[PDB]
Amino acid sequence: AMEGTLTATVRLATPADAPSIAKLIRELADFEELSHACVVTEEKLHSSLWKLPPFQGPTVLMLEVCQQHAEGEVFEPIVRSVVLKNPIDDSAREGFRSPSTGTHTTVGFVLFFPNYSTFLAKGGYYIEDLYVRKPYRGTGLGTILLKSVVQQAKKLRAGRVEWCVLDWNVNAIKFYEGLGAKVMPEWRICRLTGEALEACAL
Amino acid sequence: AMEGTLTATVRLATPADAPSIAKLIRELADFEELSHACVVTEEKLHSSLWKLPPFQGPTVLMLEVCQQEVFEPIVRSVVLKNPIDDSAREGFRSPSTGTHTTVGFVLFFPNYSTFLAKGGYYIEDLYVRKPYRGTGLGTILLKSVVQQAKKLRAGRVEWCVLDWNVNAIKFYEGLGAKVMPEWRICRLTGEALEACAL
Ligand SMILES: CC(C)(COP(=O)(O)OP(=O)(O)OC[C@H]1O[C@@H](n2cnc3c(N)ncnc32)[C@H](O)[C@@H]1OP(=O)(O)O)[C@@H](O)C(=O)NCCC(=O)NCCS
Ligand SMILES: CC(C)(COP(=O)(O)OP(=O)(O)OC[C@H]1O[C@@H](n2cnc3c(N)ncnc32)[C@H](O)[C@@H]1OP(=O)(O)O)[C@@H](O)C(=O)NCCC(=O)NCCS
Ligand SMILES: N[C@@H](CCCC[NH3+])C(=O)O
Ligand SMILES: N[C@@H](CCCC[NH3+])C(=O)O
Ligand code: NA
Ligand code: NA
């Protein structure tokens, strides 16, 4: 069991992280009660990610823990000390060994990509997924991961940082509101997919 | 002014379209009851758009009409539901062809679904000028984006709508889109974004 103080690391994901990303996307879909809709594979991540420079297309940041630079680098890892709220019991620890450092455990991820506001006439960032494994929630790790994205977005002069939440996901809403984000009740998401997308033609 | 059949053209916007795009973004913001929050300028569009290849970043397609390649223009004949009276006609002359009137625009950019593990497209803005609504022009414009998204193997085409905008909701549902009531947009901007530190 992990006790006392942890060292938390937020770093750019590499193709070697595809197995862990696939497992975390599946855990998130299971949390959102959307397992049937989730068809992610390591192969699909290799086909679609790591094609464009980081922050110029879909980009993943990995969150990892362990028991406690030159010019023009894209993303220097963010390293923070975290005093544990309670000791952590992680039965999944061995299946989440980090490919960057063997002594690190992968505990979360975030996927984000550029968006654009016409009212601001400025580019922003959109966060697609934000996920922390169950034994590591409530001790400040999700705050470090979200704030690392926001800090990068601000460095890139983002007008806004946006994302979506399920109306029933009260713990995430409280978490986002506590960081200054506003839940906008007036907007609804529209999706054109599957057969309806196939049928949509001129 | 305009009666019978129109020729509708959907084409890629160039920097010469920044004045009309700015004008149309303002009309949309006014429709969406968000005028005060709209700070678009031609200069801001020149700084943020036309920086990346089309469909690889924020991309605009213009919608233009007249009385009857990365992206080949889409040309369609449109039988007018009712004759059109356009008092703003002279302020919306097309920079591509002088005989064409700019009546709308769409802005879209790539998005990504982790559940599909596939890229898609997100439509930021979709707008048609009031005299040209309800006669099939908006359908042509949205379908032009979807056709390009499908050619680029998009898993989904997504956008958002105000819950009170029943005319856009009906239009979207009629095209096969599903309005998903469970999702809420969260935004970190302004002072809240500036105060967010690590
Ligand atoms: C939402 C999620 C990412 C947040 O991450 P977390 O690691 O659980 O978050 P934190 O621990 O930083 O913050 C959660 C709470 O703990 C509190 N907290 C942080 N450090 C703490 C500490 N050392 N001691 C006590 N409380 C602490 C924060 O103040 C926050 O409280 P609030 O929610 O009342 O503001 C995480 O719970 C998760 O993965 N959930 C399942 C998936 C999900 O909901 N995804 C959202 C996608 S839209
Ligand atoms: C929403 C908007 C983009 C749609 O464009 P439009 O040009 O009005 O759209 P169309 O004319 O293709 O479709 C509207 C309706 O007219 C009908 N229609 C189209 N051509 C027709 C014709 N020749 N004869 C009779 N009816 C016709 C369509 O079937 C559709 O009906 P439905 O709403 O019951 O499905 C437009 O009205 C607009 O700009 N509105 C204000 C801004 C706004 O709401 N933007 C959305 C931001 S999310
Ligand atoms: N373009 C608007 C959002 C409209 C979303 C619905 N089409 C903005 O920048 O705030
Ligand atoms: N990643 C999910 C959507 C989750 C949105 C909220 N984080 C999908 O591809 O459908
Ligand atoms: Na959610
Ligand atoms: Na709307």
Side-chain angles (χ1 to χ4, degrees), chain A residues 39 48 116 118 129 154 162 200, chain B residues 48 112 114-115 125 187 196:
Chain A
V39 293
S48 55
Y116 189 86
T118 55
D129 280 355
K154 288 166 67 172
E162 296 162 320
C200 190
Chain B
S48 58
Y112 189 86
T114 56
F115 291 6
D125 273 5
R187 181 181 295 175
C196 193

Side-chain angles (χ1 to χ4, degrees), chain B residues 31-32 81 126-128 133-136 138-139 160 165 168 171-172:
Chain B
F31 182 87
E32 283 186 330
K81 188 198 168 73
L126 179 70
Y127 183 78
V128 170
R133 284 178 207 155
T135 187
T139 291
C160 67
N165 193 359
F171 160 75
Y172 294 141

